[PDB]
Design a protein around this ligand. Structure first.
Ligand SMILES: *[C@@H]1O[C@H](CO)[C@@H](O)[C@H](O)[C@H]1NC(C)=O
Ligand SMILES: [NH3+]C[C@H](O)c1ccc(O)c(O)c1
Ligand SMILES: [NH3+]C[C@H](O)c1ccc(O)c(O)c1
Ligand SMILES: [Cl-]
Ligand code: NA
Ligand code: NA
Length: 536
């Protein structure tokens, strides 16, 4: 039961700047509400589906052939996310390489990458840590926008090559490869978080940050942005909507208890996210005190917030080299575990559909890894931060919400929630209670539909700190988002057009499970009765 205790890289990297962007404490209410309402029930649903059917994301829809486009959509979303997930790991490797010294590079203002405006004690970017991150690592000062991105840096190129080589050699021989990664992933982050929290509570000015964190702006609610952000982050962090959970549960024992796993994972997620936010806001308060600025303008709101905040707190400890090495090793391990999970999801989902790919695992693994490396080459250019921001905004947003809603609607309305409950009782010995059935059938779909409609209606053009993207970038992002959403109606049209018979016959074939198709000739379909749809 050590997989349940494993910490996610999302809770440590993405949650801080999403909480800081939305004012602090106002972000916690929609997050908890969505976790209770739609997060845990659908985690449970995906685990149970994968465990019962022993299939991947694509071939699990043999229970309802019309809904097979959702698996392709989630596989495409996983590929899109993996296209930029590994740049964070490359950054962590670069920082770990830079940490092997007694004079950390982010503490002084006397190096070759420092502008004459760098100050050693809108947005504030003249601090040594921010200057290091933006000029000695990204080299962003040589880029003018998404229209001018330049050539990739060779140091980040070497880091990316190392990352992809490790990823390939950790997957080329199959699943269950003696996953010692989860042992580090379940122990070290707790120690690091405890040490950082205990130290940061005592820093001068941290009280203001804690007060800001524990304050709720009720005007920040009633607007769409915080709800959309919380809903997207819940499913991003829990792993739902990527095909990871179904693929991993397809290897579980038949009588494994998915209820306990769902409960434990949800609790760990909540606790880790809250602690991470507390530590981040303590550091923010200290930084605002020391630089003599407001807390709303002291740091950036992008994907590189932790890479500035955490070295700043590390520099305040005694024995900074040891703590820096430990922290960046932990970050690297978290990233590697997440990337392994995503790659395995893609590979298993695609290999279950085509049986020829099962005899050529090494070649298929090489193809997937090389394609990911070639596509990730775009995000290590001089202006790669803009490409990364675009991908992080448009890869798993409305698309992932729509895919999750389609999965829930399919399972709970066309296959049958009572059939699902009977399937669970067959392998676990007990039947799910009324709360789970109600959440599966009515509560979660309604909230997901509302959030999808609101996200479409209230779209805001993309920005990065003080930089405003051109409109064609927004068009490109919306095209990326739609490329995964269009796959479901396309497959429905193809399945209807590729079946021979009459309208009634094709309609009956599209909704009947593949192993019950002998009932079409007998003309007895449960979906053609009122009791099937009235059943709750
Ligand atoms: C520093 O600030 C001045 C404005 O006072 C600006 O003209 C100059 O370009 C800045 N230098 C850099 C590279 O940060
Ligand atoms: N722009 C930062 C965000 O709006 C924010 C962060 C901390 C605060 O105390 C705040 O009022 C707002
Ligand atoms: N385990 C989910 C995580 O967010 C993740 C990481 C890398 C991926 O390629 C992916 O599809 C999912
Ligand atoms: Cl989170
Ligand atoms: Na992890
Ligand atoms: Na989690």
């Amino acid at each position: 039961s050590v997989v349940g205790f494993a910490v996610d890289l999302a809770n440590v990297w993405r949650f801080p700047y999403l909480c800081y962007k939305n004012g602090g404490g106002a972000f916690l209410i929609p997050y908890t509400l969505f976790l209770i309402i739609a997060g845990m029930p659908l985690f449970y649903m995906e685990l149970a589906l994968g465990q019962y059917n022993r299939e991947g994301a694509a071939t699990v829809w043999k229970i309802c052939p019309f809904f097979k486009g959702v698996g392709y959509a989630v596989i495409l979303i996983a590929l899109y996310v993996g296209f930029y997930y590994n740049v964070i790991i490359a950054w962590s490797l670069y920082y770990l390489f830079s940490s092997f010294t007694l004079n950390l590079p982010w503490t002084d203002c006397g190096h070759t990458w420092n502008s004459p405006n760098c100050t050693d004690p809108s947005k504030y970017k003249f601090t040594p840590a921010a200057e290091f991150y933006e000029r000695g690592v990204l080299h962003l000062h040589e880029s003018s926008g998404i229209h001018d991105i330049g050539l990739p840096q060779w140091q980040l190129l070497l880091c990316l090559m190392v990352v992809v080589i490790v990823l390939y050699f950790s997957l080329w021989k199959g699943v269950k490869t003696s996953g010692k990664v989860v042992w580090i992933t379940a122990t070290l982050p707790y120690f690091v978080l405890f040490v950082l929290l205990v130290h940061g509570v005592t820093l001068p000015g941290a009280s203001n940050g804690i007060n800001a964190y524990l304050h709720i702006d009720f005007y920040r609610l009633k607007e769409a942005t915080v709800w959309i952000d919380a809903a997207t982050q819940i499913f991003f962090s829990l792993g739902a909507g990527f095909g990871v959970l179904i693929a991993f549960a397809s290897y579980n024992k038949f009588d494994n208890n998915c209820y306990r796993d769902a409960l434990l994972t949800s609790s760990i997620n909540c606790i880790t996210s809250f602690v991470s936010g507390f530590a981040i806001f303590s550091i923010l308060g200290y930084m605002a005190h020391e630089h003599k600025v407001n807390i709303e303008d002291v740091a950036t709101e992008g994907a590189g917030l932790v890479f500035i905040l955490y070295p700043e707190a590390i520099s305040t400890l005694s024995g900074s080299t040891f703590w820096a090495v430990v922290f960046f090793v932990m970050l690297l391990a978290l990233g590697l575990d997440s990337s392994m999970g995503g790659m395995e999801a893609v590979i298993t989902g695609l290999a279950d559909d085509f049986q020829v790919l099962k005899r050529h695992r090494k070649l298929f693994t090489f193809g997937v890894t090389f394609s990911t490396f070639l596509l990730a080459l775009f995000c290590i250019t001089k202006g790669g931060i803009y490409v990364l921001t675009l991908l992080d905004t448009f890869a798993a947003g409305t698309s992932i919400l729509f895919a999750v809603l389609m999965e829930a609607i399919g399972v709970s309305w066309f296959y049958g929630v009572d059939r699902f409950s009977n399937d669970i009782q067959q392998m676990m010995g007990f039947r799910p209670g009324l709360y789970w059935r109600l959440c599966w059938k009515f509560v979660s779909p309604a909230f997901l539909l509302f959030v999808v409609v609101v996200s479409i209606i209230n779209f805001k053009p993309l920005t990065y700190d003080d930089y405003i993207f051109p409109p064609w970038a927004n068009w490109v992002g919306w095209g990326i988002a739609l490329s995964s959403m269009v796959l479901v109606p396309i497959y429905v049209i193809y399945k209807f057009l590729s079946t021979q018979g009459s309208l009634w016959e094709r309609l009956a074939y599209g909704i009947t499970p593949e192993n019950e198709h002998h009932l079409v000739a007998q003309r007895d379909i449960r979906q053609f009765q009122l009791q099937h749809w009235l059943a709750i």
